[model samples]
Target: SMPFPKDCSQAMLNGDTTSGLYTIYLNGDKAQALEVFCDMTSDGGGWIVFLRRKNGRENFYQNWKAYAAGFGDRREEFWLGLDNLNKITAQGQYELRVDLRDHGETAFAVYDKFSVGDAKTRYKLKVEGYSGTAGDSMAYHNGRSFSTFDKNCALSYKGAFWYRNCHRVNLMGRYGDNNHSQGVNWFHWKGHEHSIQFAEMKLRPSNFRNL
Candidate 1:
């Protein structure tokens, strides 16, 4: 499980700024999937998720947005986003950030890093934030490279952010890769600075196991 910092907060208001750092060791081996999970609620607004390499390399960065439009009351759940199977050669490090805010015209920012394992392996990083409406809640994995205009845009809630050499990969578990897998990895936010990370891999008679 990923350890959250001591200063993390549970009540993330709209435009509430927060940040995190993570280090994952790949052991020089390829991983089937890299999944990240989080338990959170929306403030009748939207949220943003970011994934980047830890070594200050701007080439491998992924940024995505999930929104909720305040339809039939506010809905909350354990959100899961996948980074899918990518090559993480040698020692690898990464950073993830989540910006949570209330709906409509606000700015929030967060940042963190991840560096662990002997060799960097492919990772699955997920982000779950509130989306106001039903079914409109979407998850974007294997982020795509930012367009020319998007890369050069200024940093703002309305404006788009650019990722230099990133691309979105397919979602894990859904592509018929593993049948034994019950669901993707699991992660939950505990208060201000704690995130419980676990992989729910079940075999046999359908039971979830933490990896």
Candidate 2:
């Protein structure tokens, strides 16, 4: 397990805002990796993760297309992994940002960032919080629509969460299918109150080494 940084904070911001920026320097081309763990308790909404190179380059990738749902009347925990691909190609200073938002509150956004490694190799990760009432809204990326909640309508704790273990698998499945998706299916676990959902990702040594 990686060590948590000493300087980390959370905040509430108006529509499309950024916060909690942290930086770390790498030493002599070292290989480094980082991961984020979160526990979400909400009635309805979505979560997002963002990452970019510290040199102000365009964002490398994003996990905003992935949607997480909590069980009825309960909270859930999930995990995500970020790395520099074993320090093979991406070797240098990097930045991270994290945000969590609710689907019901579009005007609000939460963010957090931290640095890993030194001048030789580095990694960055970000998370965001979005809350709003509408599920049909468009994502930061055009052409993609936000996911909708199950039809149960009633709040129920069913124990649900997600994690990216760095394993190779296809995640393109029908929503609420419960066969391949990593997130919990709130509709499947309805009527059960007081449930606990915990998720995490397992990165094999190979995933940490040069890719």
Off by over 4 Å in 1: 1-19, 26-100, 103-134, 137-146, 150-211
lDDT of 1: 0.21
- Candidate 2, 115: how far from true, in Å? 22
State the lDDT of candidate 2 residue by residue for 34-145, as single tens digits.
Answer: 2222112221111122221111122211232222211111112222222222231134222222221222222222212122222222122122232232221112212212
TM-score of each: 0.20, 0.18
lDDT of 1 by residue, 107-185 (tens): 2222222211221221323223332211111133222232222233212212112222221221111211122221111
Candidate 2 global CA lDDT score: 0.21
